[PDB]
Amino acid sequence: HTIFSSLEVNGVNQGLGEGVRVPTYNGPIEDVTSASIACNGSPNTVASTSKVITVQAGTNVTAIWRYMLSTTGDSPADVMDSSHKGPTIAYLKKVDNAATASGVGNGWFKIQQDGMDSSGVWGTERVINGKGRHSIKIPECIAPGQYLLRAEMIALHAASNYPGAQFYMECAQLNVVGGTGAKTPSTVSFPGAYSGSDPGVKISIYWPPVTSYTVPGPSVFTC
Ligand SMILES: *[C@@H]1O[C@H](CO)[C@@H](O[C@@H]2O[C@H](CO)[C@@H](O)[C@H](O)[C@H]2NC(C)=O)[C@H](O)[C@H]1NC(C)=O
Ligand SMILES: [Cu+2]
């Protein structure tokens, strides 16, 4: 249980729920075929926001994960329970108007992921123990303009069967400045990119203890 509730750019937090479409309830999406897998949604309720956040292409945005909207600390319990081991992931989608695009459908491309490393540590654990900071590089080579950023943590502690994996995601609204447009990523859809049978979705992280993890979704776009 966690919420990507604010975004930091060039050292400046853009504000609670400002430019990030936040639910007030921190519960996960569990059906990967639901329209809610794109930018969260029913049976949660997601707020709108008229802020569109400017970011220079080639630089990083940092998603700031917190347990609830009311949370004002950054200790591990203020981010997400340590049982919630799994990957962190981020995607972009080029849109006409970042304040009105729903995010549902085709156009997403992956720009960051962090599953399990050589020492058996998970991406969510680096966020939980790293003050909730989830750093994400905006590619320099993409087209400028309006985008959605979908940042996600998947908790796998209850994922031995499907349904079981717990998908926590929120969409930020970006104005990307300075992109060269030299490369046009191949894209996937939400819902669509994930399936209940994926080896990183239906998985026991206990039996046997996991030594290598396949993050769901497409490969990471690189310039
Ligand atoms: C910008 O975000 C990228 C990820 O999109 C960060 O790169 C990862 O950084 C970690 C931590 O040092 C490494 O474990 C990874 O190998 C990096 N991944 C890749 C693909 O390069 C990067 O550190 C971030 N930069 C800043 C300044 O926050
Ligand atoms: Cu939870």
Numbering used by the authors: 1 to 223
Paper text:
Lytic polysaccharide monooxygenases (LPMOs; also designated PMOs) are copper metalloenzymes that perform unique redox chemistry resulting in disruption of polysaccharide chains by oxygen atom insertion at the glycosidic bond. The LPMO active site is highly conserved and contains a mononuclear Cu2+ center within a “histidine brace” motif in which the copper is coordinated by the N-terminal histidine amino group, the Nδ atom of His1 and the Nε atom of a second conserved histidine in the equatorial plane. In the Cu2+ resting state, the remaining equatorial and axial positions are each occupied by a water molecule. Of particular commercial and biotechnological interest is the ability of fungal LPMOs to catalyze the oxidative cleavage of recalcitrant crystalline cellulose at the C1 and/or C4 position, thereby enhancing polysaccharide depolymerization by increasing glucan access to hydrolytic enzymes and ensuring efficient bioconversion.
LPMOs are expected to catalyze oxygen insertion under acidic conditions since they function synergistically alongside cellulases which show optimum activity at pH 3.5–5.5.65–67 Given the surprising role of a neutral His157 as a proton donor to the activated dioxygen species in our structure, we sought to probe the protonation state of His157 when exposed to acidic buffer conditions. To further support our acidic pH structure obtained by vapor exchange, a 1.5 Å X-ray dataset was collected on a crystal directly soaked in acidic buffer. Furthermore, the neutron and X-ray crystal structures of the resting state NcLPMO9D at low pH show that His157 remains singly protonated when exposed to acidic conditions. The position of His157 at pH 4.4 superimposes to its position at pH 6.0. In this position, Nδ-protonation would sterically clash with the backbone amide proton, further supporting the single Nε-protonation state observed in our neutron structure which coincides with unrestrained refinement studies of the protonation state of second-shell His residues. The barricaded active site observed in crystallo and electropositive environment of the copper potentially play a role in maintaining the observed single histidine protonation state and prevent formation of protonation pathways to the active site. However, the single protonation of His157 solely at the Nε position in our crystal structures does not rule out formation of the doubly protonated second shell histidine residue under similar acidic operando conditions where the active site would not be barricaded by crystal packing.
